[PDB]
């Protein structure tokens, strides 16, 4: 007969694995879903059923119950609503001393570590606790485990991360007016600060008095920040598809339209708050 990787929900066999096998051969592993059909048919008949009739008929599952199913590590076999064996997540939560919520790497709060381990197994294989307690806004009173350190992303969410403390021994000017000898160095200092500094422009910082002093490159245009007295080279290449009040105290139809006006005028603009300035 033929050996198939699964019985579909319609009850027929799908995903051909091997031909010319007895049931004993097809079903000789612990793989949950493997199924078998008795009939050996010519190719065209096979295609007929697989493509136009929902799978091969008289599909016989190798595993009728939880007997002999090998779900692998952290999983157990349980019979489902339709009375079929299934591999379900059963993480060992036995040696967990922390009882409260945890903040996953994904930035989401899980009820407890056991729930995070379940989500890891169920959906998100890269899921781990980044710090205990609920996830937080800002780094205030966030104490990162070990020697990891707190930073925030673009939405003020706090993360515990390991900074690349050691750069290999391409100048850049940061928006802080500091010259960095490389990306790595700027990134290192950003990590330690706990928030974005931002790249002002390639090369060494100059004591510009206006945009005329700054020679942008890479198809960038100089935007002048009148609040700090420093310039910045920005791409200005994005296209636009919730009004905002900008730092010029003007209303724009969108953060994207604000950026277009900044770019047009050579004046750096930041969102002050949502909605009309008035």
């Amino acid at each position: 007969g033929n050996c198939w990787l699964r019985q579909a929900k319609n009850g027929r066999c799908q995903v051909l694995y091997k031909t010319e096998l007895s049931k004993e051969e097809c079903c000789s592993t612990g793989r949950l879903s493997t199924s078998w059909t008795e009939e050996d048919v010519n190719d065209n008949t096979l295609f007929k059923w697989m493509i136009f009739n929902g799978g091969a008929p008289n599909c016989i599952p190798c595993k009728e119950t939880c007997e002999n199913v090998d779900c692998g590590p952290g999983k157990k076999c349980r019979m489902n609503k339709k009375n079929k064996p299934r591999c379900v997540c059963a993480p060992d939560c036995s040696n967990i001393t922390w009882k409260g919520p945890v903040c996953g790497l994904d930035g989401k709060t899980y009820r407890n570590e056991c729930a995070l381990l379940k989500a890891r197994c169920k959906e998100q294989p890269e899921l781990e606790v980044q710090y205990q307690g609920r996830c937080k806004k800002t780094c205030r009173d966030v104490f990162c485990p070990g020697s990891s350190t707190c930073v925030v992303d673009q939405t003020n969410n706090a993360y515990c991360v390991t900074c690349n403390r050691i750069c290999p021994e391409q100048y850049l000017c940061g928006n802080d007016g500091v010259t960095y000898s490389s990306a790595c160095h700027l990134r290192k200092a950003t990590c330690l600060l706990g928030r974005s500094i931002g790249l002002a422009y390639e090369g060494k910082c100059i004591k510009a008095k206006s945009c005329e002093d700054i020679q942008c490159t890479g198809g960038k245009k100089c935007l002048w920040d009148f609040k700090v007295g420093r310039g910045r080279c920005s791409l200005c290449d994005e296209l636009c598809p919730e009004p905002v009040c900008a730092s010029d105290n003007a209303t724009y139809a969108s953060e994207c339209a604000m950026k277009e006006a900044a770019c047009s005028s050579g004046v750096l603009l930041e969102v002050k708050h949502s909605g009309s300035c008035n």
Binding site: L5, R6, V15, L16, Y17, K18, T19, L32, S33, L46, F47, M50, I51, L105, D106, G107, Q124, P125, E126, V151, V152, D153, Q154, T155, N157, Y159, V161, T162, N164, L172, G174, A183, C184, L186, R187, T190, C191, R195, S196, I197, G198, L199, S234, L235
Partner: protein
């Protein structure tokens, strides 16, 4: 249950998914903050007859045997994103979900 998973211990000729860890530091992706490493996996093995084929097109083309048509190959049939924290092109710290970083399933196309 739509695909096969294998490891170093397997003796599987068919199109199968194997483990692989990607380490960004070692790849030169120095703009990534987290995670430092992740399980990407990869697809490997043979595609004979119609084994592991989900699309009827594949074998129709193989039988038509036209000029330049290679045989079907073992390739991802399902991918998953990973969440990342990284520096963007402005050196801002950005959290984002990055599509199609992980192979969930391999099949013959």
């Amino acid at each position: 249950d739509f695909g096969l998973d294998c490891d170093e211990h397997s003796t599987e000729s068919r199109c199968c998914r194997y483990p692989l860890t990607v380490d960004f530091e070692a790849f030169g992706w120095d703009w990534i903050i987290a995670p430092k490493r992740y399980k990407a996996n990869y697809c490997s093995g043979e595609c004979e007859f119609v084994f592991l084929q989900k699309y009827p097109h594949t074998h129709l083309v193989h039988q038509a045997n036209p000029r330049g048509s290679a045989g079907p190959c073992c390739t991802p049939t399902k991918m998953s994103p990973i969440n990342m924290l990284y520096f963007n092109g402005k050196e801002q710290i950005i959290y984002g979900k990055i599509p199609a970083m992980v192979v969930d399933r391999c099949g013959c196309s």
